[PDB]
Design a protein around this nucleic acid. Structure first.
Ligand SMILES: Nc1ncnc2c1ncn2[C@H]1CC[C@@H](COP(=O)(O)OP(=O)(O)OP(=O)(O)O)O1
Ligand SMILES: [Ca+2]
Ligand SMILES: [Ca+2]
Ligand SMILES: [Ca+2]
Length: 341
DNA sequence: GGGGGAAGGATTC
DNA sequence: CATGAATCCTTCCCCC
């Protein structure tokens, strides 16, 4: 079992560098402008020139400008990046029949049968890196190891524009030295619950009862961390299928007025249906971000598919339910369609 | 008791 | 100052 994980470097900004080469060398910041006020919004991603100074995804646009008032700030263009992403995704296929597209910029390849080992795999790595670089002018980092989890950790260590392998030998070392937090699927919330338990390393999960681990971080997470530590993690490369489609927007200002919120809600629905393109959902959820950044949601599943007319009237009821069951204002309103026929 | 689903939230990338 | 989606978790609930 050999897995080759491909991760496109600072993807959104790099695509902007490609569509306009004169941006190379300068700090590029791709952000999302919320409408709320002068430069309100967050940074979606930035190139490394910008990351050297603390400007990264997540921080407010207003914060990035204080640090880098002369960097190039560009509005995110998701559609463009998706098409470029797809074209790259179609190149990888040719290197493997078993391909799992994790996200718009990550993918896992089952190259167990394309090679026989870690020399031909590494070589297959460069083979792909160059193919992509020449065809799309995009640099990507490649990680290679026995399973998906370590493959990804390989790229995490290699990026940007790198390629690294983690032989069964080094896997044994990491399962003992690697900060559990750096393990995919382990965010801050989980990384902490693990420290209070004394688990600062993958192996440490072996020195604890499974029942306390289940109790603290959940069964699914417990078995995951344990198998990995036991060095028996072996998840296959599957074809992820879209289970849901939605869209959430930010309002000009918070509010609890149905008539002031509807337009944004309807706009979110219109876009969601456009993206459904032929897909018919039987379930609908209205999602709302409260003034204090809380996420509330009310939904409903129908025994039949949902028409735009139904979604329209139903979303208003779920929005009214939200308001009747939560005093806070709404900062962002949206919808999500699931359970496709 | 326990299957099976639905609803609302928790987490992560 | 704060911008799509999968998976998992907990709580119900209907029911044989
Ligand atoms: N805060 C965000 N807002 C919008 N899109 C985001 C955000 N964070 C990440 N993404 C998207 C765009 C890039 C993609 C990559 O996943 P991830 O952030 O986990 O790896 P990464 O940090 O290597 O990505 P990259 O460097 O290309 O931006 O996910
Ligand atoms: Ca990535
Ligand atoms: Ca990336
Ligand atoms: Ca982490």
């Amino acid at each position: 079992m050999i897995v080759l994980f491909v991760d496109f470097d600072y993807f959104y900004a790099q695509v902007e560098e490609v569509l306009n080469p004169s941006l190379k060398g300068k700090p590029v910041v791709v952000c999302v402008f919320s409408g709320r006020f002068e430069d309100s919004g967050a940074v979606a991603t930035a190139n490394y020139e910008a990351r050297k100074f603390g400007v990264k995804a997540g921080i407010p646009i207003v914060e990035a400008k204080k640090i880098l008032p002369n960097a190039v700030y560009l509005p995110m263009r998701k559609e463009v990046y998706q098409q470029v992403s797809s074209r790259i995704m179609n190149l990888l296929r040719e290197y493997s029949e078993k391909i799992e597209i994790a996200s718009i910029d990550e993918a896992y390849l089952d190259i167990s049968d394309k090679v026989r080992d870690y020399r031909e795999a590494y070589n297959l790595g460069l083979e792909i890196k160059n193919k992509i670089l020449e065809k799309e002018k995009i640099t990507v980092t490649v990680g290679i190891s026995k399973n998906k989890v370590f493959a990804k950790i390989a790229a995490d260590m290699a990026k940007p524009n790198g390629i690294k392998v983690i032989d069964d030998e080094e896997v044994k070392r990491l399962i003992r030295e690697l900060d559990i937090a750096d393990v995919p699927g382990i965010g801050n919330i989980t990384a902490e619950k693990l420290k209070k338990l004394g688990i600062n390393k993958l192996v440490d999960t072996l020195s604890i009862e499974f029942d306390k681990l289940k109790g603290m971080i959940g069964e699914a997470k417990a078995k995951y961390l344990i198998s990995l530590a036991r060095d028996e993690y072996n998840e296959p490369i599957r074809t992820r299928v879209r289970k849901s489609i939605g869209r959430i927007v930010t309002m000009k200002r918070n509010s609890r007025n149905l008539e002031e919120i509807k337009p944004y809600l309807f706009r979110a629905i219109e876009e969601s249906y456009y993206k459904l393109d032929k897909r018919i959902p039987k379930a609908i959820h209205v999602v709302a971000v409260t003034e204090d950044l809380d996420i509330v949601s009310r939904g409903r599943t129908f025994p039949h598919g949902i028409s735009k007319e139904t979604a329209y009237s139903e979303s208003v009821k779920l929005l009214q339910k939200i308001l009747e069951e939560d005093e806070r204002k709404i900062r962002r309103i949206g919808v999500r369609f699931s359970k496709f026929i």
